[PDB]
Amino acid sequence: SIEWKLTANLRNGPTFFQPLADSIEPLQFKLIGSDTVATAFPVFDTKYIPDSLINYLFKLFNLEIESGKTYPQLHSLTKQGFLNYWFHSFAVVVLQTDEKFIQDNQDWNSVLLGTFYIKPNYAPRCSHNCNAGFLVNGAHRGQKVGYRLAQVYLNWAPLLGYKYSIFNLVFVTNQASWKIWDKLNFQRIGLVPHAGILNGFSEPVDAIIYGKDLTKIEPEFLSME
Amino acid sequence: SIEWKLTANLRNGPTFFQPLADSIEPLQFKLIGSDTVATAFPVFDTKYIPDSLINYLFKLFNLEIESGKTYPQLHSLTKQGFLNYWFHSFAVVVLQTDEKFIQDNQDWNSVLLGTFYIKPNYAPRCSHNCNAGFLVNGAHRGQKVGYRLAQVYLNWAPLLGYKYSIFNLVFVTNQASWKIWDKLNFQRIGLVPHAGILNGFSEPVDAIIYGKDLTKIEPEFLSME
């Protein structure tokens, strides 16, 4: 079956625009500067992925929240809160594997490289703008996983019908700003001063608002080889 | 009793900052270029205001939504959806009266000038940023009600503990942009291209993102006399 990669099953996506593909096929590529193979997988519904992984990601996100430097949340989410948050619409998981399917009961602390969600950033009239949030396994720090996650995003978001990308809060202290978003030609379309009270910072941290046109993307950025 | 104007009863406001006043006292002033008196009232909870008014505002908002030019919603809200939306945290009603209390069963189509909500625009670490949405009774068009609503906002938002104001979507075709926000020195801290599909516009409409520092406001703008 291929129900698990059918755009027909897209929940809570764009109101005014249809998907540009009937399916999202898993995307294989190598980690930057490596011969190690990774595969990105679509997640239209949580049932199409193993519970053990979901529960892993659950913990991964709360650790990221508990660090207090990246996301605006103060507190850790409940399991149901996390499901409603990360899997409200669409998500992606990226695994260190060469297989074109997700296998059960894997050692996620090794195999899980990263994940992100994609949802409409606004209500229906503006729902062609998508938002995304990203997480990288800390065990795979320093391997440029976040950059690859962004390329996958650039490849897949438009396929869901999105025409433009919005990140509402990217903290200047977040190295993804200059390591990734700037590198991929995401525009800093705004700045919020003193936006966030963050763990380990005496003063409030400014936040960047990033935008990008998903209809006019640089092939250089789309290519994973 | 004065429970109805106690900041102690503020629901779902800022996590890190307390109110600067123990109460919000109703604010009287005149409509611009007029001797007609208006009074602004705090709403910390819907129980402190008459149902007939709430039901009026309910309809007023859905008309505004149905126009399809100002808000991102496509569809009219249910009564419970509207309550959860407009009264999630704080709200204000502005009435054409000289009284310092809200009276029941009034002719709102005449007496209701306008309303707005104030809530945190983000989760806790960034919850000192407030969002607001405004509505003016169409029967009082052309009387500069929206400008006064903004001045009330500027007076009261900081009192709730907010330090900065964010409007995430103000459509360029919305005359409030230049009639009000620009006039009151709200900065256009960003722009989203083609943000919204709007009723009566062939092409997508850009949206402005407005910010303002609520700790350093111009007294000129705060004064209602």
Ligand SMILES: [Mg+2]
């Ligand atoms: Mg196909």
Ligand SMILES: [Mg+2]
């Ligand atoms: Mg007092």
